[PDB]
Design a binder for this molecule. Structure first.
Ligand SMILES: C[C@H](CCC(=O)NCCC[N+](C)(C)CCCS(=O)(=O)[O-])[C@H]1CC[C@H]2[C@@H]3[C@H](O)C[C@@H]4C[C@H](O)CC[C@]4(C)[C@H]3C[C@H](O)[C@]12C
Ligand SMILES: C[C@@H]1C[C@H]2[C@@H]3CCC4=CC(=O)C=C[C@]4(C)[C@@]3(F)[C@@H](O)C[C@]2(C)[C@@]1(O)C(=O)CO
Lengths: 248, 13
């Protein structure tokens, strides 16, 4: 029988290239623009990925759409943190193999202020020495981190699916012997990082929503992101979001 | 309406 985490591991999507021509100089506008086009391709891959997570397709189609709309930024930022954490010990952002933002590229105007919220994720993964298995359980949990004010059409089932992946995160923590007040502290620490993603996403979405809405900025978003953003902007103004937390 | 997202969930793959 295959374990649940091994099933999350085989569906881990391939690395996408940004298509960034480095023979041309950098600019903040050029990088932000390239990243949005990459972001849309990465979100399309996250849809294919979500559909293969055991249990996810059993939710009402409207709930599948809802979870993907609420969590896309959280999934994008968490996965970027992982790639950055695995790339080097240095303070870099590995957006793609052809677009790595080093300390020299961070000197670009307004670059550091958007990049620091993203650098926090890899910093926490380095500091907590997060494993591949813990990451895979945590990333699936980030997909199930927000729900509508009045919940989902398959809420009962969602709470069951969510519980299963919380238990799965527990199993990965224990697999790193370990035991026992040491384990409770690992669960505390990792679920605290999961909770802080809501704050990371809030900062990322402020940039995202502003650059989308202000057409004088000339910052393009592909169909995939434009659609999700158009749908999500009113949901953040009508309080139609219940951000799930492990620690109150 | 989330046309692309619905399409990607409804399509095969
Ligand atoms: C408004 C946002 C920043 C949002 C934010 O939250 N601000 C951080 C400052 C933090 N404080 C603590 C001071 C507060 C800033 C940061 C990067 C800025 C773009 C780029 O430069 C390139 C380009 C230059 C043009 O000429 C004008 C258009 C354009 C597209 C710019 C538009 C806008 O200006 C952006 C999105
Ligand atoms: C700071 C924000 C947050 C950014 C996103 C953070 C998460 C992410 C990780 C990636 O691997 C590729 C693209 C995305 C999905 C992203 F990097 C781009 O889309 C650009 C983005 C929205 C942003 O830079 C803009 O608002 C630019 O308009």
């Amino acid at each position: 029988t295959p374990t649940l985490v091994s099933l999350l591991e085989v569906i881990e999507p391939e690395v996408l290239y940004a298509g960034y021509d480095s023979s041309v100089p950098d600019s903040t506008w050029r990088i932000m623009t390239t990243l949005n086009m990459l972001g849309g391709r990465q979100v399309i891959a996250a849809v294919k990925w979500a559909k293969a997570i055991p249990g996810f397709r059993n939710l009402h189609l409207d709930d599948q759409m809802t979870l993907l709309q609420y969590s896309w930024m959280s999934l994008m930022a968490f996965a970027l943190g992982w790639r950055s954490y695995r790339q080097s010990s240095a303070n870099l952002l590995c957006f793609a193999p052809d677009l790595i933002i080093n300390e020299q590229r961070m000197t670009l105007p307004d670059m550091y202020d958007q990049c620091k919220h993203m650098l926090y994720v890899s910093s926490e993964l380095h500091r907590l020495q997060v494993s591949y298995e813990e990451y895979l359980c945590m990333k699936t949990l980030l997909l199930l981190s927000s729900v509508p004010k009045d919940g989902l059409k398959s809420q009962e089932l969602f709470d069951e699916i969510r519980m299963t992946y919380i238990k799965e995160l527990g199993k990965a923590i224990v697999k790193r012997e370990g035991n026992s007040s040491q384990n409770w502290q690992r669960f505390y620490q990792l679920t605290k990082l999961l909770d802080s993603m809501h704050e990371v996403v809030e900062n990322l979405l402020n940039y995202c929503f502003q650059t989308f809405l202000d057409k004088t900025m000339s910052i393009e978003f592909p169909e995939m992101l434009a659609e999700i953003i158009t749908n999500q902007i009113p949901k953040y103004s009508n309080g139609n979001i219940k951000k799930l937390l492990f620690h109150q | 309406e989330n046309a692309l997202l619905r399409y990607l969930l409804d399509k095969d793959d």
